[PDB]
Design a protein around this ligand. Structure first.
Ligand code: NA
Length: 129
């Protein structure tokens, strides 16, 4: 499913992402925008053989099992395909684990390169939150 901006903002807020680990909602929406263009079905393969999945482009090397990443850790205890659902619940539960890992949102290269230090608040402007 491709989410609308405000629709995603509302869903993430509902799933407890607003200010989670002190990252405001604007951050999560910005990240999702640039990682997957708000599409829960986005997949991208990496040169190391791992693949990123879903709206937050979660990587198969550490967080999910896709059966084809040798030496995967599967730290969110899920198949990667679960990350492609129209329901963002598992994506969200796993993102919380990631962002708590030590590097916070720097784990998401597009957040770091495109959202960090910007007025991320603009991503939720106009929504009924
Ligand atoms: Na904008």
């Amino acid at each position: 499913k491709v989410f609308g901006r405000c629709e995603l903002a509302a869903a993430m807020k509902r799933h407890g992402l607003d200010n989670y680990r002190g990252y405001s909602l604007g951050n999560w929406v910005c990240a999702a925008k640039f990682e997957s263009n708000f599409n829960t079905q986005a997949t991208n393969r990496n040169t190391d053989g791992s693949t990123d999945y879903g709206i937050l482009q979660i990587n198969s090397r550490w967080w999910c099992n896709d059966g084809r990443t040798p030496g995967s850790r599967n730290l969110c205890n899920i198949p990667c395909s679960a990350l492609l659902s129209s329901d963002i619940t598992a994506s969200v539960n796993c993102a919380k684990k990631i962002v708590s890992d030590g590097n916070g949102m720097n784990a998401w290269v597009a957040w770091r390169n495109r959202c960090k230090g910007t007025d991320v608040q603009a991503w939720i402007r106009g929504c009924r939150l």
